[PDB]
């Protein structure tokens, strides 16, 4: 009966004075809006239906029309910002928050979903959802002794919505909303469902993408060990956000970085730095770059875990973007490391792959490599071994490349190159 109605028919039913006729037309709208092929969102909006749907959310006596309207609005809210805005502008936010307490689980879940789409639009709607009081009722739905008793789909939707309330920057979510959410998030991060884990990690990744104070709020909750565990998961949808979270954390303080190391993270990098997914290798290498920017004792842990050969590996062969992160990781290591640590790097074979990357058409990577060479030469100067290095660089074709770079456009490039030639060749 409610398959493939026209918008005109939906409108006629919705404007009837008959709740059952309105219910059938609302369901017909839900079915239109639930089709994967070009759902007619704008036509439904243009027909003026959103205010009617919103009013139906409040019909406690007709739970089916609450559900159908919720679903229809969910799918409108899933579209463009302008489509999401039409839902918000119809007063949907307070009406969905009221439904979070519905005795019908399918309706509460629909309201969770709709609020997730609203919040997911951006910081302003996220923050408006929060100001209307969404967080308390959302968290109340997860206030159970054991998360395993909840239906799987419902728990996944709640996790996803909460992740959207943690998402976006400029600004980041309200500090007090983050403090309120984090204890539930910590619990969900220990749940055994792969999709809940994935979304829980995304939420943590968002919360750690910011200044040191935001990182600290998360790290203080003791999640870093669980994140390192998830970093070793078999499911890529888990590894991706877990690694992003760990990566964000090591952009903080040397002390926040040490928690990642102490939790055992470095033992996972042999696999991450060889991972067949390009993006994992790239983000793992970026993570390493921010660990090598740390203290000498942290550099030493990188050395001890056998990770320098793996950096030589990525430098030698990887997607260009990963190779650029590896270049950074080396320049950092060389800027902060002791002489012995820098010697080790040369003994692992860093020179030839570094030199091969000097032929790249990226100015920034050339600057990075030139900086690293300078630091390595400096360490050799303290050992009286400048010539050994000069020879090495010459034999692998490096001197040729540095000469050319004296004739490079960029000022820093030609200067740093000239200095090296003048000082060591």
């Amino acid at each position: 009966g409610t398959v493939n109605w026209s918008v005109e028919d939906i409108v006629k039913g919705i404007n009837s004075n008959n709740l059952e006729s309105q219910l059938q037309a609302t369901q017909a709208a839900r079915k239109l809006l639930s089709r994967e092929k070009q759902p007619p969102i704008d036509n439904i909006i243009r027909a003026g239906l959103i205010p009617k749907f919103v009013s139906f959310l409040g019909k406690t006596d007709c739970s089916p029309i609450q559900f159908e309207s919720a679903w229809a609005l969910t799918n409108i809210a899933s579209g463009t910002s302008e489509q999401t805005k039409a839902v918000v502008d119809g007063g949907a936010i307070p009406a969905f928050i009221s439904l979070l307490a519905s005795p019908h689980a399918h309706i509460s879940e629909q309201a969770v979903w709709a609020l997730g789409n609203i919040a997911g639009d951006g910081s302003a709607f996220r923050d408006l959802v929060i100001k209307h009081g969404a967080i308390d009722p959302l968290l109340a739905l997860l206030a159970v002794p054991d998360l395993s008793t909840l239906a799987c789909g419902y728990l996944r939707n709640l996790t996803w919505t909460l992740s959207n309330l943690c998402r976006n920057k400029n600004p980041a979510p309200p500090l007090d909303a983050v403090e309120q959410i984090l204890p539930t998030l910590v619990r969900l991060l220990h749940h055994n469902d792969p999709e809940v884990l994935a979304d829980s990690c995304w939420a943590i990744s968002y919360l750690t993408d910011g200044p040191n104070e935001r990182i600290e709020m998360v790290v203080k909750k003791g999640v870093v060990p669980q994140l390192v565990k998830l970093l070793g998961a078999t499911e890529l949808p888990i590894v991706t956000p877990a690694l992003r979270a760990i990566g964000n954390i090591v952009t903080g303080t040397d002390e926040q970085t040490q928690k990642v190391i102490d939790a055992g993270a470095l033992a996972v990098f042999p696999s991450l730095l060889t991972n067949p997914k390009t993006n994992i290798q790239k983000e793992a290498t970026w993570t390493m770059s921010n660990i090598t920017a740390g203290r000498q004792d942290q550099i030493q842990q990188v050395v001890n875990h056998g990770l320098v050969p793996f950096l030589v590996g990525v430098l030698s062969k990887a997607d260009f973007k990963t190779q650029k992160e590896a270049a950074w990781a080396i320049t950092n290591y060389t800027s902060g490391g002791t002489v012995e640590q820098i010697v080790y790097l040369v003994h692992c074979g860093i020179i030839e792959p570094l030199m091969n990357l000097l032929s790249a058409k990226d100015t920034k990577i050339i600057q990075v490599i030139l900086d690293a060479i300078s630091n390595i030469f400096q360490a050799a100067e303290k050992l009286g071994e400048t010539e050994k290095l000069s020879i090495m660089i010459e034999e692998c074709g490096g001197l040729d490349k540095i000469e050319a770079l004296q004739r490079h456009e960029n000022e820093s490039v030609y200067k740093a190159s000239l200095n090296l030639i003048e000082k060591y060749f």
Binding site: S34, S78, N117
Partner: peptide
């Protein structure tokens, strides 16, 4: 994703 439509139930 950030937003998602409900397709079935």
């Amino acid at each position: 994703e950030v937003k998602k439509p409900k397709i079935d139930e």
